[PDB]
């Protein structure tokens, strides 16, 4: 409102986003998850930020050739490979049996370098009960 303000807490009927514009169903879960203190400036900044949209995520695989002068010519077999990922995040909190994320809907496993792996995140895809479960339990495949 012009030349007016409302308390951040939802305890006044004059708040535009208290009970009229809150709307049910879709917005209820979002409000329960992130019912932080917001105002007109925060809404405007969020709207401005929402105007930038990406396209998708992709992975980049590259390699580097070391110095080929050790034995003779280019007969050496020593090589070094490097990995790179775009639009990725590091997660250290793994849910046990939470139903918030389904199987292959929001979060999916991605290949990682064979330096520091974990089996807890590789089993988030589920889909296995006995056979594939015990197969993935003992041997964790590292991507070639």
């Amino acid at each position: 409102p012009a030349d007016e303000e409302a308390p951040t807490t939802p305890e006044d009927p004059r708040h535009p986003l208290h009970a009229h514009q809150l709307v049910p169903n879709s917005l209820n879960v979002y409000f329960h998850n992130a019912h932080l203190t917001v105002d007109g400036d925060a809404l405007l900044t969020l709207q401005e930020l929402m105007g930038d949209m990406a396209e998708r995520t992709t992975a980049i695989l590259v390699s580097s050739a070391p110095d080929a002068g050790a034995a003779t010519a280019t007969t050496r077999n020593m090589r070094i490979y490097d990995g790179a990922l775009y639009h990725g995040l590091i997660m250290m909190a793994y849910q046990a049996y939470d139903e918030t994320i389904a199987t292959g809907t929001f979060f999916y496993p991605v290949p990682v370098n064979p330096l520091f792996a974990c089996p807890e995140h590789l089993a988030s895809l589920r889909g296995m009960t006995n056979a594939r479960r015990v197969l993935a339990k003992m041997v964790p495949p590292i991507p070639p």
């Binding site: 009927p13 979002y30 809907t105």
Partner: peptide, 28 residues
């Protein structure tokens, strides 16, 4: 309704989230 979301047949446009009962609407 129940807070369970699971999945909905209307996935052509966007998934539909569930509805929770963690609110106490009031006119006044």
């Amino acid at each position: 309704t129940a807070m369970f979301a699971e999945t909905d047949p209307m996935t052509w446009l966007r998934p539909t989230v569930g509805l929770k009962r963690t609110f106490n609407p009031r006119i006044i």
